[PDB]
Design a protein around this ligand. Structure first.
Ligand code: A1B2R
Ligand code: ZN
Length: 139
């Protein structure tokens, strides 16, 4: 689990969104596995606005942060799960690293801020849903 809190927004994995996230829906994209909902309290996370390909992510299945090299956002084929059938997920970045389903929501960060959140894994790979293109999260 895990969320990004920026301004009056809350960014989560779409498959993990609650009834409250859906009742206060701002934007959602099934092909990206993202959902943004509105919050009353002001969040103070900083979103990165860059093209970095190195950063650090939090892996709850190991209680550790890991430094990783990751690919640029792209259309990557993702095997079926109980939340989605086999499909292409867009704006997805892969790294060599450990990732389990319960790890979804762990933040990936570079020196500029939050890059994205854990969304996929398996075969020794970890996939992050990118958030750097969502410029409206800051306004
Ligand atoms: C070993 S499978 C795995 C591992 C880490 C993280 C996620 C998975 C599989 N997964 C993919 C998500 C997606 N974005 O389509 C939806 C929920 C889910 O459990
Ligand atoms: Zn950066």
């Amino acid at each position: 689990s895990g969320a990004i809190y920026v301004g009056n927004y809350r960014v989560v994995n779409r498959h993990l969104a609650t009834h409250n996230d859906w009742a206060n829906l701002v934007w959602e994209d099934s092909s990206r596995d993202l959902l943004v909902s509105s919050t009353t309290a002001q969040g103070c996370d900083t979103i990165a606005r860059c093209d970095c390909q190195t950063g650090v992510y939090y892996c709850s299945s190991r209680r550790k942060h890991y430094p990783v090299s990751f690919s640029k956002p792209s259309l990557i084929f993702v095997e079926a799960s109980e939340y989605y059938p086999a499909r292409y997920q867009s704006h997805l970045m892969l790294a060599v690293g450990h990732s389990e389903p319960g790890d979804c929501g762990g933040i990936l960060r570079c020196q500029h801020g939050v890059v994205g959140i854990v969304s996929t894994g398996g075969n020794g790979l970890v996939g992050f849903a990118d958030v750097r293109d969502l410029l409206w999260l800051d306004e």
